[PDB]
Amino acid sequence: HPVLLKSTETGQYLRINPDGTVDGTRDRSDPHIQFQISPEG
């Protein structure tokens, strides 16, 4: 059950591209915007 990280002011989702670059996109269906958040411990 992944989560999305959305900029509240711009509507953009955080994306990590395969090449390691990070940017924003408004395509909610892009699988590269899905995250798992877990404790470091």
Added chain:
Amino acid sequence: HHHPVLLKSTETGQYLRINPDGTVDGTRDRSDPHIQFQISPEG
């Protein structure tokens, strides 16, 4: 009622920011509206 959150680097103290042009960087300006995030389930 909304519940915006901030995402802060433990190493550098910088908050994640998405800029209108789609670029992503970090800032220590806690008042920058661009550092506010909504986290929600994809489902």
Added chain:
Amino acid sequence: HPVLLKSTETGQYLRINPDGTVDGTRDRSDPHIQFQISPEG
């Protein structure tokens, strides 16, 4: 309470580097992949 933000599609963790740049990495040992999540208010 530090957390990791991992892309499900590529296995990369979000990172803010010493110089402030944001990228993805699979280096689990880099302390730069640790984040704190807090309420804006």
